[PDB]
Design a protein around this nucleic acid. Structure first.
Lengths: 94, 67, 110
RNA sequence: GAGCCGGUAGCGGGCGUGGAUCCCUGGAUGUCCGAAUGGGGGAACCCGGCCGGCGGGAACGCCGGUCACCGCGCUUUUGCGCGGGGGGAACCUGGGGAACUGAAACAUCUCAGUACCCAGAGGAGAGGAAAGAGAAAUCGACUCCCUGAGUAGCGGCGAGCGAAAGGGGACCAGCCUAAACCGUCCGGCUUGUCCGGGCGGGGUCGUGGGGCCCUCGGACACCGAAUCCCCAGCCUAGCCGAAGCUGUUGGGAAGCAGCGCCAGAGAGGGUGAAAGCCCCGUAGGCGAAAGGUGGGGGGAUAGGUGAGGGUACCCGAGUACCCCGUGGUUCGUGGAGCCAUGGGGGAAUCUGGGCGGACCACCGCCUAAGGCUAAGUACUCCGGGUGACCGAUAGCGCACCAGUACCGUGAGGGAAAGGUGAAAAGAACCCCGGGAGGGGAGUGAAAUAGAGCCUGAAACCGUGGGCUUACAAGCAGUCACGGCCCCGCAAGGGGUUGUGGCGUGCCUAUUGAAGCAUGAGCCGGCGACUCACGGUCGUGGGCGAGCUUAAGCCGUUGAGG
RNA sequence: CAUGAGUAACGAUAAAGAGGGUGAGAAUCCCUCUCGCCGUAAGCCCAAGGGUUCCUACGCAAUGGUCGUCAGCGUAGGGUUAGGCGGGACCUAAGGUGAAGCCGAAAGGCGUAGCCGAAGGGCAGCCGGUUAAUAUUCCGGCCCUUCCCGCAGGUGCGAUG
RNA sequence: GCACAACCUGCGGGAACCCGUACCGCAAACCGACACAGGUGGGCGGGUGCAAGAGCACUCAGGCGCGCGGGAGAACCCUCG
């Protein structure tokens, strides 16, 4: 309770280009306030929170032998930089 | 790391505070890892979580003792 | 054959079997006594995978089932297992004693 | 005690004899919904006001601690400090309370105070020390069982309905408060001498209590948890613990055989086909803990009980009682009593007042219009165990991703599917093929044991073989015989039929059926005269006086007395 | 598990024919070429309601009323982000709730006030460009919105009665 | 309270969260248990011609070709001359 962390980067393709020049996209604690995004963002990666937007998605179509389901809840949020800093290794990475 | 049980015993306010906080960050590191080293990681994840968990068990014990 | 058991890594005899030739019990569960005597398996003529040689057919088949094995063997083979008399301060020593005796002392051999 | 990262075994990585898996008891956050209560709201999601915090400060926004409502008592000012509420399979109290069907109609009546809506206390409440019984100069709380008679009786006296004291049994504490009088006291009003409310002695058990006079009196009684300490019963973890191997037919043996074995423990299951001596911490007996629960046995804690006469009396309920309007009760309107209340009347302090006999004269009875609770019968969610209780269409419907699939708007309804094998060794590999799937190799004891895969029949469709069939009119058939073919030693026995004789199919309800009356699609599994008492007649059996409920007791077998 | 039955039927008389292609196989997929029927709809569009799916990639034993190398089918992965669009962060009627209050054997009946409660009120942006896929949400050009800190200038300012 | 730090007004600075789009969507994805010719709300409804016009006939864009095919084509019901 108060363990700041609240996310998992958007290893997502399309989301790549943004990482590429100025914005970055990730999966975030389905719940964090957008200002929550700004803070986790800022103190976490020592940056400059710019433009913080959000989207959400649940799962559809998972057949399980004799019964079925479709998954849980994956949350999406995108935040941009001010200069183009931080996330380096992450980005060079994927 | 029963030994860690010990360190635990050892620290207090702001201490345990930033300890568990930073450690937590560490596990974040893990979260990140969700697609890199991985293999020997496993444990950093499960155990690390158990560890920090303890961290909390303690804070509770101590400040609880308090108020 | 329950939450409780017989010998462990141990080294014992096969009565009603096909081998009898006792030996290393590589592993033994807690509930299904499931124990492997490394005394009779097969090949599972493997996947056809490169998992086993790209030209496969697994070798060490050894899941030991039946429980007619005569666990424990001191200078004596088929014997049940005793318990204790403690003898020393805090002494469980559920070693195995009957006729001959064996307790699997933490030394020279299991 | 030495292995585990739940059901997934697989991947990819691990923790642990410096008690790791895990069994238990108490621990910590303990998301959002749900009584919800800080506010709202189509719940499980959006809002807000106070102190703390961090960040880019202010605005933003999270952790956080935060803030209904109720009535309840306390300082009228804490509105501080409590209570409840919200549940719950059945049992339970009261609240309110119905047609069927019976009475072969049916309006009294009946099912019944039953079903159901409700409110609510529990772990069980219910009732629970007598204005009782009952008539003997008798009993003695309340509750539940057997019996009391299904008589006493209630009634279109009709269908029907139907007690109570006693006796047998079980379980056996009894205890209290306003009850002006005491005095005390504070408030009173208004002052003297009324009421109000606190302390008490009084604080009625089967009758006194108070105030005056005298005899008084100087250690055994515990609660309904008064209360505390314990052996705390258990909770779930515990522990031991009896004796065989050789052989041998077998894929097997625990089996046939040989000899050797145990037993205060031949209850059972489990170990490749049926073990006391192999698996099982079981019957043998014993085991055990610092938590969560108490009856016992005893202590202490013990509020509070526990004397005698005398004397002008004042001191348990605001309505007893009587008129009608009604409930109870074995009572349905009646000669109809007692308790109980809706209307109007409308009082007695132990010469008191209801009660036995509508009522009147008697004796007798009990002591009313307040309070508390244990203990013996009920109930079944949940645990344990046993079953001339069930086997996968019976069992809970439900034996395991069935209260879910799926129909309905909601209310609501409400399936199916259990097993491969002994163990996975469950199928490398070669061959037709897009694939499935098909022939081989290996499996193996079998794979006509091969993945919906045990046992795996009937129905129906199929491949081959035997007899049979194109001038034939018949449920069917079937008696006869002749031609085929079959096992055959013959006797002859099989199946097959062409010729001919004679032949209206079965069930139900019918005076009456072939039915053109009907039932009938075909196979398979389900599918319907019982149980409890009363009785009643028989008749198989014990004594003529014969037999024993409710219970107390002994009880692997639990043995019957 | 049979039976009419391999007859009745394929959901509209808005017709289709070719060539080449890909394929284990293509009347029934892909391009392209001839051709008919819509067109006032068989248009697009917002909304509702559906809630997967949409896309991209493999696959077809089930499913389409046969096809089927096609799919809204199966397997996997990725896909919608907005101070200024919408709705709440505001308003309210009918209308529900309901502190008060009146009222029932009980459960409730009625209910001002305040609240909840609407494509009815009110409010600050548009267009051109970019993804397999979303846009006035992304990018860009252009045009604003309130609220907070300040400062600068200006005032009886200061409810929501 | 204000009034010396309340409101009206410029410039600078700084802020602005919650839930929403995919696509179907006069319809094989919404309602009829079916890829059921039924129904289901508002937005010009391109054009020619017709006196007028969302009706008419051919078309614009844009949308198709209903999803089982080939075949001779006699009875006869259908539809129509």
């Amino acid at each position: 309770t108060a363990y700041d962390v609240i996310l998992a980067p958007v290893l997502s393709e399309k989301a790549y280009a943004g990482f590429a020049e100025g914005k970055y996209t990730f999966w975030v604690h389905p719940k964090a306030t957008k200002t929550e995004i700004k803070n986790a963002v800022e103190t976490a990666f020592k940056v400059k929170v710019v433009k913080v937007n959000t989207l959400h998605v649940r799962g559809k179509k998972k057949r399980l032998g004799r019964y079925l389901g479709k998954r849980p809840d994956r949350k999406k949020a995108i935040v941009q930089v001010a200069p183009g800093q931080k996330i380096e290794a992450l980005e060079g990475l994927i | 790391m029963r030994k860690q049980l010990e360190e635990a015993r050892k620290l207090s306010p702001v201490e345990l505070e930033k300890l568990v906080r930073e450690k937590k960050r560490e596990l974040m590191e893990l979260r990140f890892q969700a697609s890199i080293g991985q293999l020997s990681q496993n444990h950093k994840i499960r155990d690390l979580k158990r560890q920090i968990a303890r961290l909390l068990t303690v804070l509770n014990e101590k400040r609880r003792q308090n108020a | 054959m329950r939450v409780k058991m017989h010998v462990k890594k141990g080294d014992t005899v096969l009565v009603a079997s096909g081998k009898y030739k006792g030996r290393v019990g590589k592993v033994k569960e807690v509930l299904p006594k499931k124990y492997a005597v490394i005394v009779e398996g097969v090949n599972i003529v493997k996947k056809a995978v490169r998992v086993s040689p790209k030209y496969p057919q697994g070798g060490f088949i050894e899941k030991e089932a039946p429980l007619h094995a005569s666990k424990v063997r001191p200078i004596c083979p088929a014997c049940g297992k005793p318990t204790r008399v403690r003898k020393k301060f805090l002494e469980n020593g559920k070693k195995i004693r009957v006729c001959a005796k064996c307790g699997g002392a933490l030394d020279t051999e299991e």
